[PDB]
Amino acid sequence: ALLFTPLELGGLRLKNRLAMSPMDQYSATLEGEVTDWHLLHYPTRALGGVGLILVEATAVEPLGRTSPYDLGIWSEDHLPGLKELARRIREAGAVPGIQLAHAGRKAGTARPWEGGKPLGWRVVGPSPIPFDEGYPVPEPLDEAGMERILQAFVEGARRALRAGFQVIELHMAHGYLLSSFLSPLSNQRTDAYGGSLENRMRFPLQVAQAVREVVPRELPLFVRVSATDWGEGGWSLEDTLAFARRLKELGVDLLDCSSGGVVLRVRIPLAPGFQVPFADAVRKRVGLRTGAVGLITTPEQAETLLQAGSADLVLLGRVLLRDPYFPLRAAKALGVAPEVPPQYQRGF
Amino acid sequence: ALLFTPLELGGLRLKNRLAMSPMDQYSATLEGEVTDWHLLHYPTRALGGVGLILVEATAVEPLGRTSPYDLGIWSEDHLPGLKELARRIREAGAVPGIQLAHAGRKAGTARPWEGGKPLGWRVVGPSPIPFDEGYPVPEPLDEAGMERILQAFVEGARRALRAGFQVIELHMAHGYLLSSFLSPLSNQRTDAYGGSLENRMRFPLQVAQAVREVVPRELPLFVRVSATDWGEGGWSLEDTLAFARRLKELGVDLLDCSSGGVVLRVRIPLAPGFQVPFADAVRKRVGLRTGAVGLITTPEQAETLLQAGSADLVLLGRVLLRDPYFPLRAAKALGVAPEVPPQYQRGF
Numbered sequence: 001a002l003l004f005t006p007l008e009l010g011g012l013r014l015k016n017r018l019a020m021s022p023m024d025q026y027s028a029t030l031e032g033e034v035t036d037w038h039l040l041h042y043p044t045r046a047l048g049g050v051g052l053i054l055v056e057a058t059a060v061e062p063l064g065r066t067s068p069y070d071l072g073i074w075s076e077d078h079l080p081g082l083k084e085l086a087r088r089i090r091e092a093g094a095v096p097g098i099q100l101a102h103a104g105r106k107a108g109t110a111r112p113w114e115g116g117k118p119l120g121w122r123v124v125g126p127s128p129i130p131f132d133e134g135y136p137v138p139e140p141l142d143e144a145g146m147e148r149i150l151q152a153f154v155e156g157a158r159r160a161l162r163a164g165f166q167v168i169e170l171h172m173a174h175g176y177l178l179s180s181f182l183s184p185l186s187n188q189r190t191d192a193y194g195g196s197l198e199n200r201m202r203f204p205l206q207v208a209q210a211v212r213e214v215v216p217r218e219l220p221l222f223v224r225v226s227a228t229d230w231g232e233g234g235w236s237l238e239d240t241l242a243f244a245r246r247l248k249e250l251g252v253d254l255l256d257c258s259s260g261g262v263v264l265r266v267r268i269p270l271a272p273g274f275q276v277p278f279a280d281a282v283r284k285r286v287g288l289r290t291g292a293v294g295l296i297t298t299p300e301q302a303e304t305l306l307q308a309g310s311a312d313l314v315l316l317g318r319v320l321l322r323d324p325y326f327p328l329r330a331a332k333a334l335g336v337a338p339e340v341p342p343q344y345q346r347g348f
Numbered sequence: 349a350l351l352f353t354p355l356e357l358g359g360l361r362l363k364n365r366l367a368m369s370p371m372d373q374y375s376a377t378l379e380g381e382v383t384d385w386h387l388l389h390y391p392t393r394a395l396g397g398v399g400l401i402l403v404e405a406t407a408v409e410p411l412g413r414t415s416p417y418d419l420g421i422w423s424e425d426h427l428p429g430l431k432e433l434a435r436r437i438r439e440a441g442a443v444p445g446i447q448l449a450h451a452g453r454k455a456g457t458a459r460p461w462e463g464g465k466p467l468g469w470r471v472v473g474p475s476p477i478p479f480d481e482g483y484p485v486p487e488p489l490d491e492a493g494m495e496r497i498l499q500a501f502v503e504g505a506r507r508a509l510r511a512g513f514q515v516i517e518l519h520m521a522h523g524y525l526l527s528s529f530l531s532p533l534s535n536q537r538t539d540a541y542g543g544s545l546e547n548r549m550r551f552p553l554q555v556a557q558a559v560r561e562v563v564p565r566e567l568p569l570f571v572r573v574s575a576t577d578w579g580e581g582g583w584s585l586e587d588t589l590a591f592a593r594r595l596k597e598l599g600v601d602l603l604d605c606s607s608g609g610v611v612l613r614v615r616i617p618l619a620p621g622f623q624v625p626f627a628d629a630v631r632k633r634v635g636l637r638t639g640a641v642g643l644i645t646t647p648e649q650a651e652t653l654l655q656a657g658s659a660d661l662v663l664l665g666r667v668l669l670r671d672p673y674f675p676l677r678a679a680k681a682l683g684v685a686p687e688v689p690p691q692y693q694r695g696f
């Protein structure tokens with residue numbers, strides 16, 4: 001069972017190939033602090049048996065939040081909460097990781113269960129194009145703004161390391177800031193940071209480069225990207241392959257291949273494993289390690305995509321919301337004697 | 349779906365018919381205090397959707413423990429831990445309950461994963477018969493000893509109420525103290541507390557009576573019994589029916605029908621729902637409310653035993669060790685829109 005074999009990234013060993021995909025809980029305080037919700041939520045899934053927990057999109061600056069209840073990492077005030085969260089994940093048996101994010105032109109929306117409506121924040125982006133009707137028009141960034149955000153990512157990464165997180169993921173996906181620089185559906189700049197493919201990758205690669213310099217090479221840096229945006233004339237798999245080549249040269253350890261979110265009016269052919277082709281192509285054609293994610297719900301499915309060489313790591317999102325001990329039970333289904341906490345041995 | 353309809357006991361409303369069966373975690377401190385293990389373990393299952401959590405066998409005196417790591421309730425020192433545990437269960441959406449126990453002649457064994465061997469404690473019992481080879485010979489109780497233990501149960505119940513537990517279960521099952529008084533395989537006394545059926549029930553009914561007086565009538569008192577001991581000439585279903593009649597008259601709200609554990613050398617015909625006949629007979633022939641427990645693992649199974657009138661409450665043990673969110677997912681399988689925490693709505 002490949003699913004339960006260790007994986008070495010940098011000098012870190014993950015004890016299996018299952019990872020908890022970052023999922024916003026919208027339950028931080030109004031200043032982005034860890035609460036009791038996270039301190040129960042995440043350790044539950046570490047006892048559940050994942051090798052790696054990626055903590056949700058954590059905002060590198062206040063206007064980078066998706067909602068007023070998102071986690072933050074822009075102040076030394078965030079460090080005590082984050083350090084405790086990382087400790088509890090670690091003590092429950094999983095490697096603690098965290099996703100650093102800036103929401104860009106999709107910043108400032110209400111929580112999904114309080115309507116999800118935009119709140120009219122002063123959002124920033126590559127070009128002056130609203131995400132959708134009702135959303136504020138973003139203010140195009142200049143080079144001093146780009147520099148300010150890049151340092152917010154760099155300082156976020158440093159703070160995450162001091163908290164004890166051992167895996168940093170940069171969120172360059174789903175139409176948030178860096179994702180929106182990559183796609184021509186949202187980036188229409190005519191300066192060094194729009195038009196060509198090389199220009200569109202320029203700012204995201206600057207952020208990745210700078211974060212890579214502050215994260216020691218024995219700890220993994222992950223990047224998450226929207227591998228296509230599903231739109232007429234948009235970011236495609238071929239562009240992802242080019243972007244992935246650059247990330248590899250620069251020392252990114254793994255590419256977490258998602259898709260969509262740049263614009264709203266597109267056909268997305270949802271099915272089990274529908275983003276696996278992107279991980280597979282990156283892995284096989286570029287030779288960069290990949291994370292597969294997207295409607296992966298079954299042990300036999302997860303093992304099969306690893307057997308096929310379509311990814312190195314399987315990320316699980318929604319299945320771990322409704323079934324947090326999935327990894328323990330998946331072992332049995334694959335003929336592996338599960339390592340369970342001794343308290344629970346008689347349930348297995 | 350009966351499984352998701354409320355149940356009224358005394359003046360308490362449980363929001364569904366699923367309950368977490370008491371299960372020793374062997375993770376208290378050496379003085380029987382609540383630790384971090386319980387504070388994560390139990391709230392997880394309350395978020396999982398059970399209407400009622402019964403906290404594990406909690407020892408009414410030190411020599412009543414099953415192991416050195418069992419929870420206790422014999423000192424005001426236990427109250428802060430227990431009060432916090434009851435609070436967190438309650439805040440995660442479940443009614444908090446607790447099982448009061450005395451291990452009797454099976455007291456003082458090592459944790460299951462450290463060998464399970466008897467530790468040679470000075471155990472007490474009805475008669476001078478070891479549980480098995482290697483176990484100490486119990487010291488037969490006299491009436492001052494019986495009185496001392498009865499007050500330990502009474503004071504335990506008072507302390508549990510002050511902690512905020514709203515359901516008290518008395519553990520009179522599985523060959524522990526009170527169970528061992530009921531069965532002739534372990535009770536061979538010739539005084540007022542052995543020989544006849546009425547004598548064998550006399551001490552257990554005194555304990556139940558006295559605890560019922562300190563628990564207000566608007567809060568449920570439950571009793572758990574071994575409905576048969578599976579042994580030649582032992583406690584049988586007919587004896588359970590007689591014992592249940594007495595508990596009903598005295599104001600016990602519910603009988604939690606388990607089986608076995610009095611002696612070791614017996615054939616137990618394990619199968620899904622194998623203790624359901626005992627709950628069914630008590631419920632239908634005595635008219636006392638019952639809890640069904642024992643290899644109940646499936647939503648359709650649980651609903652079916654309720655449809656049949658075999659019980660009022662379904663208790664789940666091992667399934668909640670390996671699958672803590674079972675109740676949320678069971679709703680969907682029965683065509684009920686589950687109430688899930690808003691954070692997890694997209695997993696359902």
Ligand SMILES: Cc1cc2nc3c(=O)[nH]c(=O)nc-3n(C[C@H](O)[C@H](O)[C@H](O)COP(=O)(O)O)c2cc1C
Nearest residue numbers: 021022023024056057293294295296316317318694
């Ligand atoms: C409630 C919710 C919150 C999410 N939050 C994030 C996030 O903060 N960052 C992110 O990259 N993806 C986020 N996602 C996307 C998931 O990480 C995952 O990629 C996606 O749900 C597909 O995997 P699944 O089918 O296993 O859920 C979220 C998804 C859900 C349903």
Ligand SMILES: Cc1cc2nc3c(=O)[nH]c(=O)nc-3n(C[C@H](O)[C@H](O)[C@H](O)COP(=O)(O)O)c2cc1C
Nearest residue numbers: 346369370371372404405641642643644664665666
């Ligand atoms: C690890 C473990 C600990 C248990 N501890 C207790 C206990 O403290 N009190 C009790 O009455 N029953 C205890 N039981 C029995 C369960 O409560 C339950 O009645 C039994 O496991 C059958 O139900 P199940 O098939 O749903 O597990 C325990 C069972 C297990 C496996």
